[PDB]
A paper describes a structure:
The Staphylococcus aureus pathogenicity islands (SaPIs) are the prototypical members of the phage-inducible chromosomal island (PICI) family of mobile genetic elements. Stl is a DNA-binding protein that binds to the intergenic promoter region between stl and str (the SaPI transcription rightward regulator), preventing transcription of the str and downstream genes, thus maintaining integration of the island in the host chromosome.
Therefore, we determined to solve the structure of BovI-Stl by eliminating this region and dividing the protein into two functional and complementary portions corresponding to the N-terminal (BovI-StlN-ter; residues 1–156) and to the C-terminal part of the protein (BovI-StlC-ter; residues 175–267). Likewise, we solved the structure of BovI-StlC-ter to 2.2 Å resolution. We have named these helices as α11, α12 and α13 to follow the BovI-StlN-ter numbering. The dimerization is mediated by the reciprocal interaction of the N-terminal part of helices α11 and α13, expanding the bundle from three to six helices.
Residue numbers in the entry: 178 to 227, 240 to 266
């Protein structure tokens, strides 16, 4: 019942978050907000899809997002 457009859109947003610059404090504030919405969207898909594919969206991408988050928290101190 998960559509390809929901999967495509999630990954599109993820890609944009990753390609983002993070040079200024404003950018970092925005990226962090975006990370939170991506975690939520990943887990939404993961729960709806139910190595099995669903584990990537339930666990792996939220873990990678958390990683990127800590890093961005590393700069802004």
């Amino acid at each position: 019942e998960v559509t390809i457009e929901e999967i495509g859109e999630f990954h599109e947003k993820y890609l944009k978050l990753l390609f983002t610059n993070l040079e200024t404090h404003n950018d970092r504030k925005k990226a962090l907000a975006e990370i939170e919405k991506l975690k939520e969207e990943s887990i939404y898909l993961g729960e709806k899809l139910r190595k099995p594919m669903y584990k990537l969206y339930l666990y792996e991408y939220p873990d990678r997002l958390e990683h990127q988050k800590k890093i961005i928290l590393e700069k802004d101190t």
